[PDB]
Structures are given as C-alpha cells and as structure tokens.
Enzyme design. Structure first.
Site, short mmCIF file in Angstrom:
data_model
loop_
_atom_site.label_atom_id
_atom_site.label_comp_id
_atom_site.label_asym_id
_atom_site.label_seq_id
_atom_site.Cartn_x
_atom_site.Cartn_y
_atom_site.Cartn_z
CG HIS B 37 -13.05 -9.26 -23.74
ND1 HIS B 37 -11.96 -8.46 -24.09
CD2 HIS B 37 -13.21 -9.20 -22.39
CE1 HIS B 37 -11.45 -7.89 -22.90
NE2 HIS B 37 -12.23 -8.36 -21.84
CG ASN B 51 -20.37 2.64 -3.17
OD1 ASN B 51 -20.49 1.52 -3.73
ND2 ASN B 51 -20.21 2.77 -1.89
CG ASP B 81 -10.63 -6.85 -26.77
OD1 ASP B 81 -11.88 -6.83 -26.90
OD2 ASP B 81 -10.14 -7.37 -25.74
N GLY B 172 -12.78 -7.41 -14.06
CA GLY B 172 -13.69 -6.33 -13.75
C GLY B 172 -13.24 -5.03 -14.41
CB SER B 174 -12.38 -6.00 -19.54
OG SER B 174 -11.34 -6.93 -19.74
N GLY B 175 -12.32 -3.07 -20.71
CA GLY B 175 -13.05 -2.03 -21.44
C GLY B 175 -12.69 -0.64 -20.93
#
Ligand SMILES: CC[C@H](C)[C@H](N)C(=O)N[C@H](C(=O)O)C(C)C
Ligand SMILES: [Hg+2]
Lengths: 56, 220
Positions: B37, B51, B81, B172, B174-175
């Site tokens: 996704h 950073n 997924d 933020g 995800s993955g």
C-alpha cells in the site's frame, strides 16, 4: 455530490500520503493525511481533481 | 518511541515523493522491501537518513527502477501487504547503509522486536519527527491478535505491541521494519488508529514470503 460533504478518512494503514478532500465548510479543497488504504471518495490526488469533482 | 540515534538502523529507508510517505528495509545493494500500500510512481529511495529534513552527508538518494507489488495483494483485506523495490543503481553499502537478513524461520509470540520509522509520534494529535524513532515491542499471539481484530487477521499477519496502548507505530511508519533478533520478521502495515488500548499494530508476516522475495529479486 454527497460524498463531497463527508469528512476526510485516513483509514487503518500507516502511510503518510498527502491527498485532497473537499472542505464544504471552507468552500475549498484541503490537504489531509491518507494512510494508504481503504480510501473513501472524498480523496483526490490533486487539488485540481478535487475541485473538478467536488467544487460546488 | 525513542530517538534511535544517528544511523543506528542502517537498513531503514525512507520512501520519498517530494516528502516522506513510507519506510522500507534494504535487503541487498539494489532491493528494498516495503508495503504494497506504499506503491507510488516516482519513488525516490533515501538511504543513510537520520534527519529527513536536512542533508547530513551520509545520504544516498537513489530512484526506483521497478516497484513490484505482491501478485496477491488484496487492497481490501490487506492480505499479502508486501512490495519489492529495485533501485536504479546499486547502493554503496557502508556502516550507515547496510541491509537486513531475511528470516529462516518465523518468530514466536513474546519475541521482542525493534520497529522504526519517521511516522507520527502522537497517539491522538500530530507530530512528525525530524529524526528516526525506534520502539521495542513484543510479537503477540495469534489468538490475541484475532481477538483484537475479529475476522481480519490472515495467516500472513501478526500483531505486535502492548494491549495497554501508548506505544505503537503510526502513519508515516508503513513499509518500515520489524526486526527481531537481527532478522526482518515484519513490515509496518495497519491498525485501528494507533496506540489505542486493545488494538495493537498489525504487521505483514515476512517469514511466509522468503521464497517469493528471493526468486523475485533473482529474476528481475
Ligand atoms: C515505530 C516508530 C515510532 C515508535 C512511532 N512513529 C511513534 O513515535 N509512536 C508513538 C509511541 O511513542 O509509541 C505514538 C504513541 C504512537
Ligand atoms: Hg497515530
């Protein structure tokens, strides 16, 4: 369009994808965070798309 | 969450499209694993980050050649997924950019794992960090995962975290990795909100995919 009145839906997935939704209250398309899945229809990939479909 | 420390999770990648939208894990010089996704066009992978808003001199920004979503990803149930990303150019593996080993077996409930990302740091509220965040969380039992989320947990998912709340992965993230005893056991995927009580995070079960990942990397 009735879906254009509906509140922005981030959904369950955890991506941070900036999309557009129609903000009826302000009479314009605004950005929100979309989680990457199970999107609702008040969710556009550009202001221009949002405005074209929802801007009323 | 806590501040991992600069270049302390060397296999952590940011997926960028003008801004950080997802994370990922480096599995070798040219391949990244992420969530299905997280599929976008025009992905730039950024390695050697801490950073994500300033340039600190350890970065490699490399564009994606190919982005391969699992042939059986279900957009609706979130089953399978998982996605692979081939970099245009091979990365230079150093001490701040290194890859993560793929598991030989599946991790058991109660295994403590490191979950890392640049995603939201407020359960309810909004605050996106400059630097990398880390979180040590246990793998939960299948039985408890399925009771937290009735009829939504497939054999390719697991739950991790704390039934109490306040400690989770958020938007933020995800993955991004879930690494347990040096091995990549999960990918940050979904949840009912974040850091809510009785609703732990849900992760893609990477140990079920090892054969697919290898053969796909090999023939692409
Ligand atoms: C997985 C990366 C970190 C721990 C995420 N983004 C985070 O800061 N979560 C907060 C927490 O401290 O666990 C928040 C309460 C969800
Ligand atoms: Hg959250």
């Amino acid at each position: 369009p009735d879906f254009c009145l509906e509140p922005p839906y981030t959904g369950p997935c955890k991506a941070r994808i900036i999309r557009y939704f129609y903000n009826a209250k302000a009479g314009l398309c605004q950005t929100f965070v979309y989680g990457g899945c199970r999107a609702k229809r008040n969710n556009f990939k550009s202001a221009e798309d949002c405005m074209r479909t929802c801007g009323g | 969450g806590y501040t991992c420390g600069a270049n302390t999770v060397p296999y952590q990648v940011s997926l960028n499209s003008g801004y950080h939208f997802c994370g990922g894990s480096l599995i070798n010089s040219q391949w990244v694993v992420s969530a299905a996704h997280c599929y976008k066009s025009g992905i730039q992978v950024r390695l050697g980050e801490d950073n994500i808003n300033v340039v600190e001199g350890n970065e490699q920004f490399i564009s994606a050649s190919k982005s391969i979503v699992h042939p059986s990803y279900n957009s609706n149930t979130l089953n399978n997924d998982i996605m692979l990303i081939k970099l245009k150019s091979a990365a230079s593996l150093n001490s701040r950019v290194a890859s993560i080993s793929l598991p030989t077996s599946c991790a058991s409930a109660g295994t403590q794992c490191l979950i890392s990302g640049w995603g939201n740091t407020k359960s309810s509220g909004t605050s996106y960090p400059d630097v990398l965040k880390c979180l040590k969380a246990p793998i939960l039992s299948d039985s408890s995962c399925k009771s937290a989320y009735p009829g939504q947990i497939t054999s390719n998912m697991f739950c991790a975290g704390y039934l109490e709340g306040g400690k989770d992965s958020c938007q933020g993230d995800s993955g991004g990795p879930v690494v347990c005893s040096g091995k990549l056991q999960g990918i940050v995927s979904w949840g009912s909100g974040c850091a809510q009580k009785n609703k732990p995070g849900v992760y893609t079960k990477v140990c079920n995919y090892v054969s697919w990942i290898k053969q796909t990397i090999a023939s692409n």
